[PDB]
């Protein structure tokens, strides 16, 4: 199992954090 999906959401979070 590869939890890559959540790591991709981490990119979304890191991306959002730049705005917020």
From Swiss-Prot:
Q: What protein am I looking at?
A: Pesticidal crystal protein Cry10Aa
Please state which protein family the record places this protein in. Answer: Belongs to the delta endotoxin family.
Q: What else is known?
A: Toxic segment of the protein is located in the N-terminus.
State which stretch of the full-length protein is shown.
Answer: 134 to 153 of 675
Q: Which organism is it from?
A: Bacillus thuringiensis subsp. israelensis
Protein's job: Promotes colloidosmotic lysis by binding to the midgut epithelial cells of mosquitos. Active on Aedes aegypti.
